[PDB]
């Protein structure tokens, strides 16, 4: 597995709505999540 370093910063990578309930990757949404 690939460990890929990002940041948090808006559109880039954003917390996801509900995102407690979720795990791993599908935490996080934005440009660069995609």
Same mark, same amino acid.
């Given at each position: 597995?690939?460990?890929? !370093? !990002?940041?948090? =910063?808006?559109? +880039? *990578?954003? +917390?996801?709505? %509900?995102? =407690?309930?979720?795990? $791993? %990757?599908?935490? +996080? =949404? $934005?440009?660069? *999540?995609?």
């Amino acid at each position: 597995t690939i460990v890929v !370093t !990002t940041i948090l =910063e808006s559109p +880039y *990578v954003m +917390y996801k709505k %509900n995102h =407690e309930q979720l795990e $791993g %990757n599908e935490r +996080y =949404e $934005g440009y660069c *999540v995609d």
